[PDB]
Design a protein around this ligand. Structure first.
Ligand SMILES: Nc1nc2c(ncn2[C@@H]2O[C@H](CO)[C@@H](OP(=O)(O)O)[C@H]2O)c(=O)[nH]1
Ligand SMILES: Nc1nc2c(ncn2[C@@H]2O[C@H](CO)[C@@H](O)[C@H]2O)c(=O)[nH]1
Ligand SMILES: [Ca+2]
Length: 104
């Protein structure tokens, strides 16, 4: 079973942990990857009911299981805060335009 289902993409907790760890190390180093400069702040315009505090950062999680290294980030993302706490997993799939919905 998938711990997070983003559209048709299935992710286990281990996939999330791995993506979050990569995103958080770049955040700590003040580095970014990709033309959209990830990880970057996630404003929570959608108003998700995250149980950890802000600020939040978004980092792509890939269905190939590879860690994001530039290029297309796809639709899914892990959202972590300053304390490296996971906020949630969200995706643009099933959301209009560039909005997000949560992974279930
Ligand atoms: N919808 C949405 N995008 C946000 C917010 N915080 C930052 N952004 C960024 O705004 C850009 C336009 O939505 C997104 O790029 P993305 O296409 O690469 O995810 C995303 O990174 C947010 O809270 N909601
Ligand atoms: N795959 C995919 N990408 C999306 C979607 N909505 C926006 N995108 C953006 O389109 C580009 C290619 O995935 C990236 O910037 C994505 O963030 C979506 O629904 N599916
Ligand atoms: Ca996997």
């Amino acid at each position: 079973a998938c711990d997070y289902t983003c559209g048709s993409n299935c992710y286990s907790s281990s996939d999330v942990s791995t993506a979050q760890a990569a995103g958080y190390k770049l955040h700590e180093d003040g580095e970014t990857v990709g033309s959209n400069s990830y990880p970057h702040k996630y404003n929570n315009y959608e108003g998700f009911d995250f149980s950890v505090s802000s600020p939040y950062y978004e980092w792509p999680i890939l269905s190939s299981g590879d860690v994001y290294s530039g290029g297309s980030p796809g639709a899914d993302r892990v959202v972590f805060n300053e304390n490296n706490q996971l906020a949630g997993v969200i995706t643009h799939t099933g959301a209009s335009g560039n909005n997000f919905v949560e992974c279930t």
